[PDB]
Amino acid sequence: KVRWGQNRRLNFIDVRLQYDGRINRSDLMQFFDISAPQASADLGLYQQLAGDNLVYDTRQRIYLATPEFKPITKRSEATRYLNELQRLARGIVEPDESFVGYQPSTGVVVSPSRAIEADEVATLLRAIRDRVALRVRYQSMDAPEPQEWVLSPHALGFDGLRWHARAWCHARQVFRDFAIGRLDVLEHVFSAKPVDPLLDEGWNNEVTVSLVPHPGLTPSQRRVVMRDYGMVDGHCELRCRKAMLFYTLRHLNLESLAISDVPAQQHVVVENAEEVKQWMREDRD
Amino acid sequence: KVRWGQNRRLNFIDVRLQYDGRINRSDLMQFFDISAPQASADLGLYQQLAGDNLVYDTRQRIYLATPEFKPITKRSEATRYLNELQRLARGIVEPDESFVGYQPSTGVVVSPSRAIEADEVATLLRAIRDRVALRVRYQSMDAPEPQEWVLSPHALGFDGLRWHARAWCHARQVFRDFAIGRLDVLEHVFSAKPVDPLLDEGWNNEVTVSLVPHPGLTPSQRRVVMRDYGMVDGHCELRCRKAMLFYTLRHLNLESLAISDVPAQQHVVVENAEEVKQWMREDRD
């Protein structure tokens, strides 16, 4: 059997062949800090497992991907690789943490936010896991003077820009959202009443947002929008938690539910506008 | 010296102690498919390198993080770990590809898009690296009937939802953007004129968007906004390529430059509105 480390080196060969179209022994030696004989043995094992993927060129002393290349691992897929380029450009990871070979010039939009402390995220995650209540300070636009609350968190949500904790608010007796960047966790409240998170109907009930191309588009433009949004059969059925519906519409700029008279500024419309309106009124209550 | 594999296992111990607050030998054995003696040796090496971070509890047979814990690697930082939770929830990676231990219930907004083929991304990346021209089919809202162009790509951009190639358009004689999900790459055009990407002024000129809290906010609300946006000293200086300015403003909902009379719907305003307007007119030209 192939051990975990060597398998990661086979993944590295596979992804370099897929995107760079070539790999040298020295690329393996430098990334993984292995010897020339081990790196040659890794390339030999890749040749044994998937010989049609690559040829060795003795003039250039390099392995070249063939036109027949097929990745041996799903970890070489395009969504993952584009996500890696985003993480490198945003500085989330360093080049020595990534299998990416050629790094193109990249421009990625910036999401300005408060850097969160690991210790606070950790306290929240463990409180979720252990179903325990936390005394916190929280400040908001409607209540900017920091105020203390007792919260029992049970989930995390990401709205496209920032994270929030989904939690029972013991004072207001509701499940609701708390931006993690606005929370100061102070101590545990072990005497608080246990909360059943299965009672958070907004979090646990999934709903469907049915999206279609704006009906004022020509058939040719419709096909463009369909391809842009990965629509199968002329619509896109987006599934989300009811308590994530508002965030989802904001993330996709779908908050204006009416079908406008301007197709060019509204490529996609929500088919089930009345369901969506109703679901948001229920959840904000 | 510690080898690459064992160092990844030390990283795994560090991140489990930071967020789960505990780790068992069997967690290492199962994730990395190693023997009990090797996993014990990894935990012993972690104890040697950072003994104040953890204690072994013989009653529970588990290693517990201490209140004094300090991560031995920056790879345990919170931005990375929250990014991992996002990638797991979006299905970008599988649990066996991630060091995340406890996985909370998560809700993440959905970005509907066309799944891109690795082979097309690969052809584009290599064309960027080798500075070669490509014959492509492209369809857009303004020109929906697929049309062929000769493009020399030199960079990639991400607008918050989708990727584009930055490229010289040989027919229209301009540098401009092409959504990768709308591109069909057909063949290389080796007889085309070479293009100097240093002549793409929009791509290479960085500009500053100066952001401040809306001036109608009370001082207490201002402090909330400042914390939300990670503002140092009452403003945020966002740096981006001129050719990414429009995408940046759209991603942050800053396209309406005027200072509105409604602080609650416009938490942040652009200080240098006239510079930004001018820079966008230059770039769309």
Author numbering:
A (entry chain A), B (entry chain A): 8 to 292
What do the authors say?
Here, we identify a novel transcription factor, CapW, that is associated with hundreds of distinct CBASS systems. We show that CapW is a transcriptional repressor that binds the promoter region of its cognate CBASS operon to inhibit expression of CBASS genes. Two structures of CapW from different bacteria reveal a dimeric assembly that likely binds a small-molecule ligand to control DNA binding and transcriptional repression. Our two structures suggest that ligand binding to the protein's WYL domain causes a conformational change in the WYL and WCX domains that triggers a large-scale rotation of the wHTH domains to release the protein from DNA.
We next crystallized and determined the structure of Sm CapW to 1.89 Å resolution. The CapW homodimer adopts a distinctive domain-swapped overall architecture with the N-terminal wHTH domains adjacent to one another, followed by extended linkers reaching across the dimer such that each protomer's WYL domain interacts primarily with the wHTH domain of the opposite protomer. The C-terminal WCX domain adopts an extended α–β fold, and each protomer's WCX domain reaches back across the top of the dimer to interact with the WYL domain of the opposite protomer. The two WCX domains define a groove across the top of the CapW dimer that extends between the putative ligand-binding sites of each WYL domain (see next section). In Sm CapW, both CapWR32A and CapWSQS-AAA eliminated detectable binding of the protein to its binding site in the CBASS promoter. Together, these data suggest that our structure of Sm CapW represents a DNA-binding competent conformation of CapW. This histidine residue is solvent-exposed on the top face of the CapW dimer, and is surrounded by a cluster of highly-conserved hydrophobic and polar residues including Tyr145, Ser147, Trp156, Arg169, Arg183, Phe185 and Arg189 (Sm CapW residue numbering).
